[PDB]
């Protein structure tokens, strides 16, 4: 077949900028017809790929997200979280000496409109 696929537009929101990047879904970057980046989800044009790792903002797929940070538009691989190393040993314990009372909310829908 003569390559087909969806085209999606990545936008930071018109209240931030009017810059945009375009993803050609499962299209090889040699059969599209600057910043051209090949991802397992398709060919991404108009965003620069960096080697840092941030929290995901606009999800593209296969671990890759986009953000408006560096301004400009970039792509990158998400960060799952920090890195904690517990000082484990066979005779050490940690015990709290203080505490805080915390308050959170949860919202749940119960009904809909009767038509």
């Amino acid at each position: 077949p003569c390559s087909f696929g969806g085209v999606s537009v990545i936008t930071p929101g018109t209240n931030t900028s009017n810059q945009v990047a375009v993803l050609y879904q499962g299209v090889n970057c040699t059969e599209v017809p600057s910043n051209v980046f090949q991802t397992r989800a398709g060919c991404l044009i108009g965003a620069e790929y960096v080697n840092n790792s941030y929290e995901c903002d606009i999800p593209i797929g296969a671990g890759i997200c986009a953000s408006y940070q560096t301004q400009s538009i970039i792509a990158y691989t998400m960060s799952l979280g920090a890195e904690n190393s517990v000082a484990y040993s066979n005779n050490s314990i940690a015990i709290p000496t203080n505490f805080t009372i915390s308050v959170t909310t949860e919202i749940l829908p119960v009904s809909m409109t009767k038509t």
């Binding site: 999606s8 537009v9 018109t14």
Partner: protein
Amino acid sequence: AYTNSFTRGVYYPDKVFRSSVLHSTQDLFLPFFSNVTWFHNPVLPFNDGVYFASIEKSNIIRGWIFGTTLDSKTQSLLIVNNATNVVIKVCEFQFCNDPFMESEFRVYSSANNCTFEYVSKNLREFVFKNIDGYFKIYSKHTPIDLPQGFSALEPLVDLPIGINITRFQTLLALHRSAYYVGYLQPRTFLLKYNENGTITDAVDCALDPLSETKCTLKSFTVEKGIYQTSNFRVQPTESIVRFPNITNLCPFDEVFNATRFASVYAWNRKRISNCVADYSVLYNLAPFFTFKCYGVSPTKLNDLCFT
């Protein structure tokens, strides 16, 4: 010279009042950020409607002429406006090759078979279009290279003429004692109406990506995210028709032009193979042939094949 339009050639697509409703319409418009020719004159093409702007406090432009040949032997439009008011007239004319006390109107010398009569700095915009035999004119006069802004144009007249147009020219007042020409294309816009019923903004839905996102979402403010707006389809080039060989004409002659046909009880069957039939040889001979095809016509299968 050429100039760059910005958002120009937007007119009210129809009657019908309306309030805050990002309405979607398909019609003939002047594309945003287009290439508009500039003139300071020669017959120009028509092809499908015309955008025509100009700037000048005095009135140098003294009407237009439209039609197919801009000559006699066929009907044409003539629209003039002296210091009184607009006078449209539709006759067969004979136009001067250079048409133009305070006495004037040496434009034509013939007015035969008239089928319509009518009598009655600064930016003067016009849109001319001709659809289903109707010659419509949109216009607006707003007092002050074109500037930058948005303003929708209102219909003025609608003339059920029927006349075809393929070319037009312009008329100017000479010295004895500047205008624009755009063209319209089939495009899609998303038009914003205010509560007074006027068009205040528009989005060209075939301009850039962002605009396609606004049009698909039906909004002028897009929130951060990723939106599917369209599709990518590679297109094929060239038409390669292969075959092994062989050639000859199908002997239909010996079937239709036979001296004697069989009796129906003992009907005769000629099998056809390995030939090229021009089924268009048939159909002809109109006085008593009758053709009655079941499953297809006689035009479409001439580009078909069977075992």
